[PDB]
Paper text:
IDH1 is a highly conserved, homodimeric enzyme that reversibly converts isocitrate (ICT) to α-ketoglutarate (αKG) through NADP+-dependent oxidative decarboxylation. Tumor-driving IDH1 mutants catalyze a NADPH-dependent conversion of αKG to the oncometabolite D-2-hydroxyglutarate (D2HG), while typically ablating the conventional reaction. D2HG competitively inhibits αKG-dependent enzymes like TET2 and JmjC lysine demethylases, causing DNA and histone hypermethylation and cellular de-differentiation.
In addition to the NADP-αKG adduct, we encountered an NADP-tris(2-carboxyethyl)phosphine (NADP-TCEP) adduct when attempting to crystallize ICT-bound R132Q. There may be catalytic relevance to these adducts since the TCEP and αKG carboxylates helped coordinate Ca2+ and maintained many hydrogen bonds in their respective active sites, though the metal ion was slightly shifted to accommodate these adducts. To better understand how these adducts were forming, we performed density functional theory (DFT) calculations for model NADP-TCEP and NADP-αKG adducts, which suggested that adduct formation would not occur if not for the constraining environment of the crystal structure. If the NADP-TCEP adduct could form in the R132Q active site, it would act as a competitive inhibitor. While DTT has some similar structural features compared to ICT, it does not recapitulate the carboxylates that the TCEP and αKG adducts contain.
Author numbering:
A (entry chain B): -8 to 412
B (entry chain A): -1 to 412
The structure:
């Protein structure tokens, strides 16, 4: 039967190393398991550290699992996160929650720190809503502080709201009048940010612009918040003058501070092709406008780059697609776009491979991104993208693939691509 | 024999401004308003020179004058920064006149694009206008902010006036370096006025109303906006809305921004102060031209209005003008400031002729531009800035003069 041992038909899976996975809710959870089953695990073996951030396990552990996941990301340097339920009043009723738990993304970000870089996932055949955006716009959202770690409260009636700083060294405290309510009640809030966090934010922004060869703009409202936003402006400018200016000049680019009002108009009018450093809230809100302006709200990458220069968390930024989940729970067909979740996995695994000098893993991660884009541009897509192209009322069943058909088509094309290489 | 009589005008609080907008303001009065309308103008000079001279008192005096006369029109003004401070040798870096007038008067700033058929939008589907109603009081614009110079505790406290024990909310314990911190507030009555003005504007335009907040994150602060609007709607407006086949909904700011991008327009968008400030720039630009916007502060008394030009004082054109070089400065926003004010004056005085005039001036502006006579910025909207030749646009004086010729023709025909 032949003295020479013939080669195996099954080929050796890639050693991918250590990865923290944050499991999610509803249809995104369904998608997440399909991605692992059909796209990752046949080709990559992982030392996978899985945390269930589904709403029921967050409730059971009093949100401790979210903290545990963040600490694990510190330890292993790579996290990949599925979309999760951020509960409102209805979710409190539906799950009999102990509390209207806060957004886990905010908790993870306030623990890890850094900058969330957000960018559209561009398909040649998905039309833009903004005509001129022929190059990408990359938002760098400062991931720490401000509204997302504030303390807000109802003022029940007349009285003084004051804000006080008490120096740790025992020198005199300073007290500022926020407002004397003399005619009724209202609301008040305190919020803050940290110098070191702002410095990390500036560093990540300058470095991303220099890595791309694109100009950088930071938006603030320092005309109104002269101290608070002026601190962002000053720290960026001093870091630019100290370390990065000659690097920008050598690449013929620039960094400029802009008022947020001007910056959103300028962005809308632009051709794309720049980095936009945003304070936490502005990056949160403006990335929705950028995501929708490129064609599809969900076709975004979202990667938290932590201040240590080694740790990354990639996530799907859209929601858990509740209506599709309900259909799926009744055995009905859905057409759920998995691209954002797939790219969470590929961006995470690409950083894993960079940390590990894993050439096989890096080739794989890029190959999966290529397969996803090429599949869509070849005309095989989920219903939402079909509607981007034709308009929802004109979509017919042959224009799109359902959730399982689309995953299977990606799996076929990934197998072809890895075979050809 | 009867003399040629100007249209009765009434009492208008004028606030004069700075730089190129001051120049075009005088041009508008001279060529478009004064030859046809006779005004009882109460003029306040909010030029940065007089604001430094009076220690910003003139701004407050103008705001009170508006309280008195119910109709105010405002030119663009310099909001000084460090550069302005050194340039004019200012005593202080005074706050923006707008912020002061708004804190004094209260109300909601309604902003909306001025649409010309030949000016292409940047957002494909916006075939109907989007009207933003920006709450004009509180939040960031009245906040107390400071630099935290080193390790220490920041807390924000509430002390009831009636003696009941205070409550202290920890903001942050800075253990390593320093940072920044800030308190801000809003008032129930001002939010209720905001809601009432939003519901009324929606009913008058016959469009649905969305309010945006971030109450996912700010459950108490933004929760109050949401709760107040929902209660005032259920109790006082839902039936009228349903009668006009419109509706009111709360939306998260993230959702609202994306859906507006993807929508057809045709709705009222109630915004917290900061969001209205920022999103209206985004909307203005998305319709084609950032400066083609009306901006009208509607005060809670339901009678007092302040119309302004929202854009800046066009400093580069002013420098050209100073050196006797021609400029192409678009005066439409300042014109519509005047016409919106005059239309409110006509409404208050039941002045048929003045209302006819204000609408006519708006029509003449739009038709002039749509007939192909425009300033350089709109030419560039059409052809793209690199492709604009001198023959594609009119300079500031030529455009003003063409508007005057067309306004004379329009008023004569009727
Ligand atoms: N990451 C996360 O963790 C998120 C969790 N959620 C949780 O998802 C749950 C529901 O969320 P909805 O908002 O109701 O939306 P949906 O996902 O149900 O989709 C609505 C309709 O659109 C269509 N459709 C959408 N995705 C599709 C897909 N893949 N394929 C195909 N069709 C798709 C489809 O339409 P048809 O039904 O007609 O086919 C579908 O029904 C609730 O529990 C939310 O809390 C929401 C968003 C983020 P996000 C954090 C962002 C950040 O951290 O930066 C804000 C997003 C933003 O800012 O833009 C939460 C806010 C916070 O945490 O503060
Ligand atoms: N309302 C006001 O009173 C404002 C006053 N200012 C004060 O104006 C001063 C300068 O301002 P810049 O920011 O440098 O801009 P610019 O006006 O000089 O134009 C820059 C370039 O664009 C082009 N161009 C613009 N307008 C054109 C026009 N008509 N025709 C033709 N081409 C035109 C042209 O381009 P070329 O040169 O290539 O031809 C030109 O050079 C500074 O001193 C500022 O303080 C700024 C804006 C508002 P704003 C209140 C908004 C609100 O309350 O609703 C925030 C802006 C926003 O939110 O949208 C600040 C005050 C506050 O904080 O309250
Ligand atoms: Ca967002
Ligand atoms: Ca603005
Ligand atoms: Cl299916
Ligand atoms: Cl001229």
């Amino acid at each position: 039967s032949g003295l020479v041992p013939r080669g195996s038909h099954m080929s050796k899976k890639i050693s991918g190393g250590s990865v923290v996975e944050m499991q999610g809710d509803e249809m995104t959870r369904i998608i997440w398991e399909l991605i692992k089953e059909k796209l990752i695990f046949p080709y990559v073996e992982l030392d996978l550290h899985s945390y269930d951030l589904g709403i029921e396990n967050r409730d059971a552990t009093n949100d401790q699992v979210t903290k545990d996941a963040a600490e694990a990301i510190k330890k292993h340097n790579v996290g990949v996160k599925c979309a999760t339920i951020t509960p409102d009043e209805k979710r409190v009723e539906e799950f009999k929650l102990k509390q209207m738990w806060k957004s886990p993304n905010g908790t993870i970000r306030n623990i890890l720190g850094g900058t969330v870089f957000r960018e559209a996932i561009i398909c040649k055949n998905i039309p833009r809503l903004v005509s001129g955006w022929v190059k990408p716009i990359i938002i760098g959202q400062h991931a720490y502080g401000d509204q997302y770690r504030a303390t807000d409260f109802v003022v029940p009636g007349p009285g003084k709201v004051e804000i006080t700083y008490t120096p740790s060294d025992g020198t005199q405290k300073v007290t500022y009048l926020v407002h004397n309510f003399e005619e009724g009640g209202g609301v008040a809030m305190g919020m803050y940010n940290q110098d070191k966090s702002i410095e990390d934010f500036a560093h990540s922004s300058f470095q991303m612009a220099l890595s791309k060869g694109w100009p950088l703009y930071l938006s603030t409202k320092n005309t109104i918040l002269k101290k608070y936003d002026g601190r962002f402006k000053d720290i960026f400018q001093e870091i630019y003058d100290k370390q990065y200016k000659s690097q920008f000049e050598a690449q013929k680019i620039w960094y400029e501070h802009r008022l947020i009002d001007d910056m959103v108009a300028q962005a809308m009018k632009s051709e794309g092709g720049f980095i936009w450093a945003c304070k936490n809230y502005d990056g949160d809100v403006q990335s929705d406008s950028v995501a929708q302006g490129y064609g599809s709200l969900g076709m975004m990458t979202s990667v938290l780059v932590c201040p240590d220069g080694k740790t990354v968390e990639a996530e799907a930024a859209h929601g858990t697609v509740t209506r599709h989940y309900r259909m799926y729970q009744k055995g009905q067909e859905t057409s759920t776009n998995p691209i954002a979740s797939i790219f969470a996995w590929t961006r995470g695994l690409a950083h894993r491979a960079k940390l590990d000098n894993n050439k096989e893993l890096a080739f794989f991660a890029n190959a999966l991104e290529e397969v996803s884009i090429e599949t869509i541009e070849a005309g095989f897509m989920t219903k939402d993208l079909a509607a981007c192209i034709k308009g929802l009322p004109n979509v017919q069943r042959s224009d799109y693939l359902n959730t399982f058909e689309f995953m299977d088509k990606l799996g076929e094309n990934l197998k072809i691509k890895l075979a050809q290489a």
